[PDB]
């Protein structure tokens, strides 16, 4: 039901009502994201955000929970003058959906973060939150964007691109 707009007013509650006891939380977050991302499409600012904010509490994994909150912060911050530090949340979403989402296409969100570096003026909270991650990063998957990451060396604020360059 993710397409076909008109059923989204009754596609939310038709799935948000069962929520059984599933002998383990290997799929609870994909519940609390997917109906939550039905609230991402239509303008529902608050219950999608807390639904993602509790689905991220369930496993701290299955990075589509980390991703679609990034797509929803794209849907928010594509609509306002983007001087504010509200995309630091988005770069933390794409970055902490980049590493652990393994063995599939990361080029959408990694090609997103290569643009989100250069909205940098003038808050350094973007590169501070970029520096704030610890864990795994897709060492092999940056390679395809390495021309676009070397002709972005020439611009200012490349002192965090060097962390991507150094392990390649």
Swiss-Prot record:
Coiled-coil blocks: none
Subcellular location: Nucleus
Miscellaneous comment in the UniProt entry for this protein: Although strongly related to the PI3/PI4-kinase family, it lacks the typical motifs that constitute the catalytic site of PI3/PI4-kinase proteins, suggesting that it may lack such activity.
UniProt comment concerning the protein's domains: The C-terminal domain (2233-2836) is essential for its ability to interact with activators.
Entry's family note: Belongs to the PI3/PI4-kinase family. TRA1 subfamily.
Binding partners and assembly: Component of the 1.8 MDa SAGA (Spt-Ada-Gcn5 acetyltransferase) complex, which is composed of 19 subunits TRA1, SPT7, TAF5, NGG1/ADA3, SGF73, SPT20/ADA5, SPT8, TAF12, TAF6, HFI1/ADA1, UBP8, GCN5, ADA2, SPT3, SGF29, TAF10, TAF9, SGF11 and SUS1.
Biological function: Essential scaffold subunit of the transcription coactivator SAGA complex. SAGA acts as a general cofactor required for essentially all RNA polymerase II transcription. At the promoters, SAGA is required for transcription pre-initiation complex (PIC) recruitment. It influences RNA polymerase II transcriptional activity through different activities such as TBP interaction (via core/TAF module) and promoter selectivity, interaction with transcription activators (via Tra1/SPT module), and chromatin modification through histone acetylation (via HAT module) and deubiquitination (via DUB module).
Protein name: SAGA complex/NuA4 acetyltransferase complex subunit TRA1
């Amino acid at each position: 039901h993710y397409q076909n707009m008109n059923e989204l007013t009754t596609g939310l509650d038709v799935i948000s009502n069962t929520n059984l006891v599933y002998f383990g939380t290997v799929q609870k977050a994909e519940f609390f994201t997917l109906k939550g991302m039905f609230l991402s499409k239509l303008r529902a600012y608050e219950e999608a955000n807390q639904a993602f904010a509790t689905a991220v509490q369930i496993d701290l994994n299955l990075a589509k929970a980390w991703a679609q909150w990034g797509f929803f912060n794209d849907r928010r911050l594509s609509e306002e003058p983007n001087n504010i530090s509200f995309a630091s949340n988005a770069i933390s979403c794409y970055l902490q959906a980049a590493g652990l989402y393994k063995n599939s296409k990361i080029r959408e969100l990694l090609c997103r973060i290569l643009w989100l570096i250069s909205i940098d003026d003038a808050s350094g909270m973007l590169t501070n939150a970029f520096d704030s991650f610890r864990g795994e990063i897709p060492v092999w998957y940056w390679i395809t964007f390495i021309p676009q990451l070397l002709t972005s060396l020439s611009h200012k604020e490349a002192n965090m691109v060097r962390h991507i360059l150094i392990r390649i």
